[PDB]
């Protein structure tokens, strides 16, 4: 009944949230630096974190 | 080990801790001309796509590679000249640059003397322009160092090759390193105790 607990929303993935996290999972796989992380994230609206 | 660890090439691209990438091109190419054998030397530059453009950007550095594969001995003095002026100003090369000078000499002399079993130094004057006694004392000091054994006839102007080095040099590395190693363990052995 609103009593008692802490309210924290779980946000959907966002563009700017996609950039940094993209680099994070990309830390373990060998690749060159000619990859544009700006254009690749906009192509994936919605979907999910996983 | 330097060229081996430099195999990543363009995959690191420009980085702050990697300083200038254009100069990284030159540093990685200066090591490939020693420890990399000629089949593998062109294997890295010709077959490697990422490294092919950066060399096309600088015509002075590219000159040295393609002239080295071209075997022309007139340009090597002029090209190594520039390489030596850049070797002096750049750091960390002060101790090591004087070994490099002769390194590229013996690396050109290898492919040189491997083609013909009998050769005359007067023919070398045409490619060197013009060495007479210069290469005389030069080659003499390369021979005295056990670097590329070749038998030269003095005053008869004849050079002989040979050298089937797979006999003595095969077995000579063993004694050269073995003596130093065991002389090290002699000191460590007498340390303990007192």
């Amino acid at each position: 009944p609103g009593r008692i607990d802490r309210k924290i929303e779980f946000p959907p993935p966002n563009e700017e949230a996609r950039l940094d996290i993209l680099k994070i999972h990309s830390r373990k796989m060998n690749l060159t630096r000619g990859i544009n992380l700006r254009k690749i994230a906009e192509l994936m609206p919605g979907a999910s974190g996983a | 080990q330097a060229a081996e660890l430099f195999l990543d090439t363009v995959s690191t691209f420009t980085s702050y801790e990697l300083m200038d990438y254009k100069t990284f091109v030159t540093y990685t190419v200066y090591v490939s001309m020693i420890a990399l054998e000629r089949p593998d030397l062109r294997e890295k530059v010709i077959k490697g796509a990422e490294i092919l453009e950066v060399l096309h950007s600088l015509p002075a550095v590219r000159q040295y590679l393609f002239s080295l594969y071209e075997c022309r001995y007139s340009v090597f003095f002029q090209s190594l000249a520039v390489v030596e002026q850049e070797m002096k100003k750049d750091w960390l090369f002060a101790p090591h640059y004087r070994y490099y000078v002769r390194e590229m000499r013996i690396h050109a002399y290898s492919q040189l003397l491997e083609s013909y079993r009998s050769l005359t130094l007067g023919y070398m004057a045409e490619a060197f322009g013009v060495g007479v006694e210069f290469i005389d004392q030069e080659l003499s000091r390369f021979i005295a160092a056990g670097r590329l054994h070749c038998k030269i006839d003095k005053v008869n102007e004849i050079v002989e090759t040979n050298r089937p080095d797979s006999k003595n040099w095969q077995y000579q590395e063993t004694i050269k390193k073995g003596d130093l190693l065991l002389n090290r363990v002699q000191k460590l052995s007498r340390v303990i105790n007192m």
Side-chain angles (χ1 to χ4, degrees), chain B residues 114-145:
Chain B
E114 197 77 1
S115 306
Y116 298 145
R117 88 167 172 258
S118 182
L119 183 143
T120 170
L121 53 96
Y123 179 79
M124 303 278 87
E126 303 176 359
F128 295 157
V130 283
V132 170
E133 62 276 356
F134 303 139
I135 50 170
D136 182 27
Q137 43 189 26
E138 194 168 346
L139 296 182
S140 180
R141 295 163 292 184
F142 280 77
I143 303 176

Side-chain angles (χ1 to χ4, degrees), chain A residues 31-34, chain B residues 10-13:
Chain A
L31 173 70
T32 170
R33 296 193 204 268
Chain B
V10 184
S11 64
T12 66
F13 257 94

Side-chain angles (χ1 to χ4, degrees), chain B residues 167-178:
Chain B
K167 173 63 174 63
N168 278 156
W169 183 267
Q170 192 171 10
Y171 310 152
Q172 181 81 206
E173 306 192 339
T174 62
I175 185 61
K176 294 297 181 174
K177 299 295 291 187

Side-chain angles (χ1 to χ4, degrees), chain B residues 27 30 79-101 105:
Chain B
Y27 299 152
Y30 282 157
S79 61
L80 198 150
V82 180
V83 178
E84 183 89 351
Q85 272 296 150
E86 189 67 23
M87 210 61 70
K88 300 280 206 60
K89 300 176 65 60
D90 190 89
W91 72 83
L92 61 79
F93 287 130
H96 315 321
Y97 79 77
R98 296 176 99 183
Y99 179 72
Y100 174 73
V101 168
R105 304 184 173 174

